[PDB]
Design a protein around this ligand. Structure first.
Ligand SMILES: [Mn+2]
Ligand SMILES: [Mn+2]
Ligand SMILES: [Mn+2]
Ligand SMILES: [Mn+2]
Ligand SMILES: [Zn+2]
Ligand SMILES: [Zn+2]
Lengths: 250, 249
């Protein structure tokens, strides 16, 4: 059993954006299911649990020390690690934190890590094992050193690709050659005439999947402007928008 | 009219500390009214609202843009500013942020401030005015550049002093000479010998008030160990422990 739950599907600004009265933000206030907390996921493989990123601010209420096996981080932007701060001073055994070899980290996490063990840095395209789950780091195109991950068990493959703007060539080629059955993909922006710098727009994602050919692409890291667009425009077949609490099977 | 609310009365670790099952933490799990969120406050002077620090994670739910007048920051440790991150990308007019002239800030706040305006730096012992409220920055003893504040109206004087270990001489003397009727004070630890380095213990706060003689000292920034101690020991007359949500008029 490999499942993935999207615990947050937004960016740093979130939905609702603070004070915004656009159609998407008003909807999320009225109907909480449309709120989007910071982009993050929970992988359950057999008994083992991996927390992909740590942008939620209530992890300490969702989990106890030892109730999950490790963190897997994409990068050290605040919206992906701010949730580690209420955890580090906890009581319990060390908690492994797997992620890119970013030498600075975020604020004083590295200098004062508490129960978090950041020594578990990983390498592009070098597979590691999480309680049987095969994980491959994939370099992404972003303003910080950022890895996405291929997660594989028994030839079932899921790709976690946030945050990124149009994939590096080696990563694109690897994904084409290791076709994911499901790809969770940063698509912050509605379709644009130009590819944005740090996060994909819809047109970029469509272009990428013409090469990768994943049969199920789930868009995440959704901005309020993209939600507004989605309220009036349909996605093409094969693409769906993620939402907080979405459960993904294989 | 002047009201002060202690919206958070804990430190970075909080109460309950994650995974801790000591008497204080277990109590705070059974009864959330004993939880302590990061040290922060709200000052209301007539209609004007100042948010002191921004350690709470849900300011975006408590407030809308324009519903308060400014932030007043003591220092840029993460547990005092982490709540600004969910706000900066909002929709609204610029929000003044008053605070010490820390050149670095925290993470990328200064480079990418969004609606936050960090240009409102303040100076030790130089009074400034917030909608009629007279505010004096007071240097504190802490690992980052940190100011506490005297808040003064025609008849009332309240000091907000966190985070700090002891007080620098000029600040101590200023407080003795401008005796606060209420002093909200960092007291992270139960009575110790000696120090501590970055946050007061109870013996240090007692020593400071031997000089300042404020008639009402409210302890904040309380660690779980100090809470556990308080479950079994009384404080002297004139000292009380803050709680999240406590209102002071
Ligand atoms: Mn990022
Ligand atoms: Mn992001
Ligand atoms: Mn503090
Ligand atoms: Mn501090
Ligand atoms: Zn909006
Ligand atoms: Zn405890």
């Amino acid at each position: 059993s490999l499942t993935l739950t999207l615990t947050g599907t937004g960016g740093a600004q979130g939905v609702p954006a603070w004070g915004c009265e656009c159609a998407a933000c008003a909807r999320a206030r009225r109907s909480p299911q449309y709120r989007r907390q910071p982009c993050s996921g929970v992988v359950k493989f057999n008994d083992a649990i991996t927390l992909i990123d740590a942008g939620l601010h209530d992890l300490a209420d969702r989990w106890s020390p030892g109730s999950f096996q490790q963190f897997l981080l994409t990068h050290y932007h605040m919206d992906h690690v701010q949730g580690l701060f209420p955890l580090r001073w906890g009581v319990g055994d060390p908690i492994p934190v797997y992620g890119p070899p970013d030498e600075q980290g975020c604020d004083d996490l590295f200098k004062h890590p508490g129960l978090l063990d950041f020594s578990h840095t990983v390498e592009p395209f070098v597979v590691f094992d999480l309680q049987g789950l095969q994980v491959t780091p994939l370099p992404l195109n972003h303003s910080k050193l950022t890895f996405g991950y291929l997660l594989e068990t028994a030839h079932s493959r899921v790709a976690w690709l946030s945050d990124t703007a149009g994939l590096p060539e080696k990563t694109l080629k690897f994904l084409r050659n290791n076709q994911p059955q499901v790809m969770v993909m940063d698509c912050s922006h509605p379709p644009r005439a130009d590819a944005p710098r740090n996060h994909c727009d819809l047109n970029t994602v469509l272009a990428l999947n013409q090469v990768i050919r994943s049969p199920r692409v789930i868009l995440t890291h959704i901005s309020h402007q993209f939600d507004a667009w989605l309220m009036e425009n349909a996605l093409p077949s094969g693409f769906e928008v993620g939402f907080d609490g979405m459960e993904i099977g294989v």
